């Protein structure tokens, strides 16, 4: 049943889950509760058009660019949360400082899209800490350059969410993503792969115990990692179109460094 | 199932051995040193190997075209192999075509790695060895079409997989249920599910040593698809060169 090796893996899964809850205010469990059905101030105000958007700004704490800026800041914040979480991953802070930067530089967006799926269903996405919900249709109808940014995330989210992972699963998966080893520019790949192998072992057991009847969930989840890369690249090219189409459009420095020479 | 997975593994290996002329074991012997292949390291050596070895104006272009000739050949070998995978033939015909159309490229690079090392690649069934430098020394954008494969190969070969491993991995690549246009994704995923179990057992029995090799191999699929997207890119750019009708059709 349980053994010395298996026991260390469960301890790691728990540590990671506990750190995950402490680092990310809006978990998938909370997201799903708001999306499925409640009464408490859990019910989100829905934005599906210009007027409703107008209304949401009064109920929630051109539009194309206003949505852009809001989504832009939330990513900066997400980077901060992910960065905080990364430090809790055993051995991560002990690695060469440059590699810590490299790992974050490349894992941050893959993680952002992974967790964003937790806030999405086929019809829309929770915003402003769960207070609002912006429909998929509204986002897809935005001015040419802007109405093409979210669909690819929704397409991914609908399929990824089909795996039915919960937060304890995601906590370990997110750690695996960060501690890659095949990221461009890494100095000491060995120590990084040793940590990842251990996280992989933890994720494998975690999925088997939490999802007994889900055959090869582990392999299916790992394959999803390719969907994430695709999302990142595609997103980058779309970002380049924006930089040129809206010379009056900014872009937070933090995000700008992540994308530099990516 | 313990035994049902090994039967599947053995079956794929046997079929893979029969569908693919040059195996990794075969190529490895030839690559490290175990008939010394003709080496193409520069222009004159190529020219010599052409009439001396006999393969099948402007070198960069002819080399690029030879890559296509071999790719098309490989496709038939892969198609035949795909047909030996249990369940494949019973799938909707259009899906089979969809799965092959999107999978051959991934498989081509996977297998191409078996014939590469950090210094070059084995050509024309091991008879030759085109050097990595000669390839990188090609002009226009041609001196950069093989390099990404080498970099992928270098990383992929580090897993030290053997033919029996690759046989199952290649079947997994073919039965990808996320290919665009599929009409009945279920059977495809049910087969890949069965193949993934077989691949997992195979890697644990064949390499007790390397921890999480199964997971590491699957992560390599991220790399593969990038090599492909990237390859499709260069191919379109190449579509901007002046320097048949029936051949252009075949390819
Ligand atoms: C998945 O990408 C998005 C897209 C739109 C977003 C957000 C995130 C967040 C943040 C979040 O969801 O956590 C908010 C608040 N969005 C807004 O709709 C918005 C609307 C008007 C203004 Cl002025 C500013 C922001
Ligand atoms: C959670 O995933 C996303 C999705 C879209 C994003 C971003 C992050 C970031 C932040 C980043 O990429 O670091 C920017 C700047 N996005 C946009 O360009 C954008 C354009 C138009 C609209 Cl309507 C909404 C968003
Ligand atoms: C699985 O599909 C392929 C695709 C391309 C290939 C090969 C196999 C092999 C392996 C083989 O042919 O045995 C080689 C050597 N490829 C070349 O890059 C190449 C380049 C220039 C010329 Cl002129 C000829 C071949």
Swiss-Prot record, chain B:
Crosslink Glycyl lysine isopeptide (Lys-Gly) (interchain with G-Cter in ubiquitin): position given as 18
Subcellular location(s) of the protein? Nucleus; Cytoplasm
Result of changing residue 70 to H: In colon cancer; sporadic; somatic mutation; partial loss of ligand-binding
Per the record, the domain of life is: Eukaryota
Instruction: Give every NR LBD domain span.
Output: 4-251
Find motif (9aaTAD) and give its ranges. Answer: 245-251
Record note on what altering residue 68 to P does: In colon cancer; sporadic; somatic mutation; loss of ligand-binding
Associated disorder is: Defects in PPARG can lead to type 2 insulin-resistant diabetes and hyptertension. PPARG mutations may be associated with colon cancer.
Chain's role: Nuclear receptor that binds peroxisome proliferators such as hypolipidemic drugs and fatty acids. Once activated by a ligand, the nuclear receptor binds to DNA specific PPAR response elements (PPRE) and modulates the transcription of its target genes, such as acyl-CoA oxidase. It therefore controls the peroxisomal beta-oxidation pathway of fatty acids. Key regulator of adipocyte differentiation and glucose homeostasis. ARF6 acts as a key regulator of the tissue-specific adipocyte P2 (aP2) enhancer. (Microbial infection) Upon treatment with M.tuberculosis or its lipoprotein LpqH, phosphorylation of MAPK p38 and IL-6 production are modulated, probably via this protein.
**Family designation:** Belongs to the nuclear hormone receptor family. NR1 subfamily.
Q: What is this protein called?
A: Peroxisome proliferator-activated receptor gamma
The protein's organism comes out as Homo sapiens
Q: Which gene encodes it?
A: PPARG
Give the stretch of the parent protein shown, with its full length: 235 to 501 of 505
């Amino acid at each position: 049943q349980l053994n010395p090796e298996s026991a260390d893996l469960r301890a790691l899964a728990k540590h990671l889950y506990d750190s995950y809850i402490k680092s990310f205010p809006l978990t998938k469990a909370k997201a799903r509760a708001i999306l499925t059905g409640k009464t408490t101030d859990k019910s989100p105000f829905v934005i599906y058009d210009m007027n409703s958007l107008m209304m949401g700004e009064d109920k929630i704490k051109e539009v194309a660019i206003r949505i852009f800026q809001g989504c832009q800041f939330r990513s900066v914040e997400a980077v901060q949360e992910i960065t905080e979480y990364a430090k809790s991953i055993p051995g991560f802070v002990n690695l060469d400082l440059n590699d810590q930067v490299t790992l974050l530089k490349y894992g941050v967006h893959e993680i952002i899209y992974t967790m964003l799926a937790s806030l999405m269903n086929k019809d829309g996405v929770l915003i402003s800490e769960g207070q609002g919900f912006m429909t998929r249709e509204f986002l897809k109808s935005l001015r040419k350059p802007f109405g093409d940014f979210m669909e690819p995330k929704f397409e991914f989210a609908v399929k990824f969410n089909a795996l039915e992972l919960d937060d304890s699963d995601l906590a370990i998966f997110i750690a695996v993503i960060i501690l890659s080893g095949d990221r461009p520019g890494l100095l000491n790949v060995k120590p990084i792969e040793d940590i990842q192998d251990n996280l992989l072992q933890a994720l494998e057991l975690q999925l088997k115990l939490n999802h007994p009847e889900s055959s090869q969930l582990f392999a299916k989840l790992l394959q999803k990692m390719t969907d994430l890369r695709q999302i990142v690249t595609e997103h980058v090219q779309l970002l380049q179109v924006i930089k040129k189409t809206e010379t009056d459009m900014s872009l937070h420095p933090l995000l700008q460094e992540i994308y530099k020479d990516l």
